[PDB]
């Protein structure tokens, strides 16, 4: 468990425009999420949650300034909308629904736009206006397997929004199936551990990670405890976090304890430059472990 | 004179939204302005000037994304417009008109909006939506003489746009007089050296810094060479630069050399967090000095 005494820096006041505001909202949202699930507010300071929640609501409200009439998001309203940023807003707001009031028309409008404007006939999600802060997208910044990585990223956002939006967005179940088809068709050709992990989570959420795909997912780990590529450590933390979430979806609780151990032994507590995806994902994944299998420990 | 070899950190790529983009635009605009006047492009490398102009045009074009329909500016289009930021864009664009193409409808639309929407019936300019980046407004930040300091700041911007805009904005001369009236009526009650300096320049531009007001302006200086809020180095560089511009308007060349010398002795070359106003003002003021006293004697530091 990441001790609350080491997480004070994650309580951040969001500011800036469409991208930077989300860079600021990210650590506060996910710190509250993780401190909640690990029952660490007595140590952190019980009275401090109210203020954190006010900062999350400020982040949410400020983000609406960058909601374009299409319901998509960009750094500023005169900039063409970003597929990735819109999917990231969906990912954050969906997780934050039990913390603050999230307008379902914002969330589901963003989902519908992604599907109707940015999914292609083969199921891929396409980015036409990349975020300026490329450091906020984690391992997706790498040029290789970008189609697969982004399609998995967006698909994960649709899945995390499905319960809220499935009655409001006609196109949602078919979009999920199409994206799933694309990932499944190309999974065995993947070479990056990062893509194996993020696409693995997306497929496992649909019950479509099995057979030789599931074997590729599991055997891609090094020392059965991490998904790693030659490159930035932060990308490996992010990848292993997506893999932990896929293991939990799979209920592979035997495999989980070494992965959790490796994540704790990285002594990574979020925050800093280029930390957005690693921070969201490591605390999302460890919170989900605490919720689902804290009894499985090394 | 600030040596061109010391200035290359002022050529920067502007980025971000309506406030940050101007934080980036400021050093490069004023660096080119200063290098032009002091004819230092040899030491710097004359091949570099075209690239700097392209960086200025990029800042200009990017800034237009944050021009709201009213012609006012804020950090983002859905934010309530800022009186200060709109006046600062007018200030920067007015000085950049000789470097790149500045659309006069953009510039004078902002001027007209300031007068029609943000000047009160007693001539004060009011800020209803302060900038998020309070570090970019210099010594106006936490300045308790708020109406005097902001009215002086906006008036100064109106004056630097007057030649371009008075033909398109027929309310500009009256707005200038009313702002000046407000400053002159309350100048003697000022206490902050910063406000004395910036309102001093605004009045001097109009020929209305005289008599006891002129005496207060001059005797507020310390050691006859600076306008000082103790411990506030960047504020003081900015304020003393406004004071130098005021002295040059007064043509008080007996007073000017020690002020120029103090500014040079700070070994301050702009740039860095919170440096926007100090950077714009010191290079504006020292360029005007070079322009007004072109054959002054070499500074022996
Ligand atoms: Cl941004
Ligand atoms: Cl609470
Ligand atoms: Cl905007
Ligand atoms: Cl900004």
Residue numbers in the entry:
A (entry chain B): 1 to 298
B (entry chain A): 1 to 301
What's the paper's own text on this?
While the circulating C3a anaphylatoxin is involved in inducing inflammatory immune responses, C3b (reported normal plasma concentration: ~210 ng mL-1 but levels are markedly higher on infection and under certain disease conditions although its short half-life (< 2 min) makes accurate measurements difficult) facilitates opsonophagocytosis and clearance of immune complexes through thioester-mediated opsonisation of primary amine- or hydroxyl-containing antigenic and self surfaces. During activation in the fluid phase, the majority of C3 molecules do not covalently attach to surface-exposed hydroxyl- or amine-nucleophiles but instead the highly reactive Cys–Gln thioester moiety within the thioester-containing C3d domain (TED) of C3 undergoes hydrolysis resulting in the generation of C3(H2O) and formation of the C3(H2O)Bb alternative pathway (AP) C3 convertase.
A crystal structure of wild-type human C3d, harbouring a cysteine at position 17/1010 (C3d numbering/intact pre-pro C3 numbering) (C3d17C), was obtained at 2.0 Å resolution. This 17C-17C disulphide creates a link between the two C3d monomers at the C-terminus of helix α1, causing the convex molecular surfaces of the monomers to orient towards each other whilst simultaneously exposing their concave binding faces. The 2Fo-Fc electron density map at the C3d17C dimer interface shows that chain B residue 17C adopts a dual conformation with one conformer existing in an unpaired oxidized form, perhaps due to radiation damage. This indicates the disulphide bond linking the two C3d monomers can occur in a partially disconnected state which is consistent with results from size exclusion chromatography experiments suggesting C3d17C exists in a an almost equivalent monomer-dimer ratio in solution. Importantly, this dimer retains the ability of C3d to bind SCR domains 1-2 of CR2, the αMI integrin domain of CR3 and SCR domains 19-20 of FH. Staphylococcus aureus immune evasion proteins such as Efb-C, Ecb/Ehp and Sbi-IV are also predicted to bind the C3d17C dimer without any hindrance as the concave surfaces of both monomers are exposed and accessible.
